[model samples]
Target: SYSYDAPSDFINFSRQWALEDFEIGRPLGKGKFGNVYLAREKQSKFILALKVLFKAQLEKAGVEHQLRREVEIQSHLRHPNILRLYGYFHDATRVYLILEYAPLGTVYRELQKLSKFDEQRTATYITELANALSYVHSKRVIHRNIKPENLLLGSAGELKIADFGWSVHAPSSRRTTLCGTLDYLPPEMIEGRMHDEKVDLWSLGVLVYEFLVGKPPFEANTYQETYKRISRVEFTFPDFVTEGARDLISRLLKHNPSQRPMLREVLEHPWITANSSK
Candidate 1:
C-alpha cells in the first residue's frame, strides 16, 4: 500500500498534469476515483480525455490494486471499441490517466435524453459493445463492470467501452473477486461464489435487457430487497421480448457458472442473429 502521507516529491509525481494545462473544455465527468477533463494537445491539437485519481481515496479503500490493474490492462489494449489509454502517471497523492475522449459522453446520458433506444440504434450499440467485450475476453481480461454508464459514444456515433476500474485478468481456475453494479451482478457474485469471465456475459445480459425494456430486470424499492431478488433470480421479461432474446438472457443469467453462455456463444445465439434491430 502507498503511504498517504508521502513526501512532497512523491506527491508531485501525481500532479504532473494540471487543470491549467487543459486547453479549453470543462470537466467531462466526476466520480469517486477522480474527475475526467477534456484537453487538447498543444502541438498536434489532438484532443484527449484526462482521468485524474486521488491516491488518498484509493489507499483508504484498500483497492489500489484495482487502479494498477486498470492502468496496466488499458495501456496495453488497443481496440476500436475499447477506450484507449495513451499513458498514465502517479504521484504520492494522485494519478493521471491519459485517455481517448468520447465527445458524445456516456450512453446512460443518451438513454436519459431519449428515454430509450430505437431498435436499430440499440442493435448497433449492442453489436459494437459485444465485439469490444469479445476482444477483451480474448485477451484474458474480464470487464467486471459493464453498465450503460461505462459505455461511451464518440462524435461519429462509434460505441466505446470506457472505465476499466473494476476489470481483472484471471485465469479460469484462479478467478475470484465480485465487483460490479448491483443490478447487473451475476448470481455467482450475489451468492458469494468465485467467478470468471462469464460474470461479464451476465452483465451484458442485464444490459441488453435494460436496453430493450428501459429498466433492469431486477427491481425493488430497497437495496436489501433488490439483493434478495437477485439472489433468488426472481425476474421476468415483458411479453414484448422475443423468445430468442428471452432465451439468451435466461442462459446468460444462469445461476450455475458453468451453464452460463460465453461471449462467442451469446453473439451467435438466435436472438442476436435474428434481431435486425441494430
Candidate 2:
C-alpha cells in the first residue's frame, strides 16, 4: 500500500529499504526506469525482485501516471505469464516495487545464449505469450511495448510479460502514442496514426520473425530508412520458414489494421495450430 501526505514544500515524500535488510542476492538487469535487484525477504525467505525508480528521473519524464497505472494494473492481474507485483512503496526520493522474480531472467538474454529457438521451442513460447497478451487485452489494457526484453522466463519455464510502463487502458478509442521499440513498432505507429490492440499483434509477428531469423526482417543502416521500409512492408523470409508461419506473419504485419489478424485468428492459424499441437 502507498501512503500520500501533504508536504509544505510540495516535494514528494521518499523512503528507503536497507540493502542489508533486503538480503541482496544478485543483479537481474537494468532499464531506462531503474535497475532490478534480486533480493529476498529476510524474515520469510521469499525471493523477489526489487525495482527501484529514482524520483528525479520519474518527475523529469512525467511518469507519475505511468507508474501509478502500472501498479494498479499489476496489483489486479493474476495471470501465470504476467509478472506479479507483490507490493510497492514510495518515499520522497524514490519508489520501490516488490515483484515476483523470474530466475531464468529475460528471454532476450536467453536467446543471446542459444542464438535462436527451434520450431517447437518457438511455438511453445509464442503460445504462452499469446495467452498472456489475450489475458491483458481482456482487461482492456493495450501493452504498447512488446519486445524480447519485456519477456522473461520464469522458474517453471513459463513466459512472463514484464514491463507495463507503456501499457494503456482504452477499449473504444484508438491511441496515437508512438511508444514501443522501433523494430517491433507497427505500421500504423510508424505512420503516426491511431492504433488499437492490433498493434500488439503486429509486434508479435515481428517477435516471431526475430525469434526464428535472429533479426528483424526489415533492417536498414539508418532509422529513417528502416521506418520507410517498414511502412512499405518491404521484407522477405528465407525458405527455411514454413509457409504457414510466413502467411500468418504477413497477415499480422499488414500495413492496414483491418487486414491484420486478430489474436483469436492468429491463434487458430495453421502455423500456430500445427506447431503448438506438437
Clashes of each: 5, 5
Query: 1-278, model 2: which lDDT tens digit per residue?
Result: 24422111211212334444467767788767688889887756778898888888877876777677777777678899999876677667878777889988888988898887777788778888888899998988878789999998899788999888777785424333545568976566566445677778888989888888888888799999999988999999978988877887888898887788768887777778788842
The weakest ten consecutive residues by lDDT in model 1 span: 4-13
After TM-score superposition, the amount by which residue 174's alpha carbon in candidate 2 deviates from its true location, in angstroms, is: 9.3
TM-score per prediction, in order, is 0.82, 0.84
Candidate 2 segments whose C-alpha is farther than 4 A from its true place: 1-21, 171-192
Model 1: CA > 4 A from native: 1-24, 171-192, 276-278
Q: Name the best candidate (by lDDT).
A: 2
- The CA lDDT of each predicted structure is 0.75, 0.77
lDDT for model 1 comes to 0.75
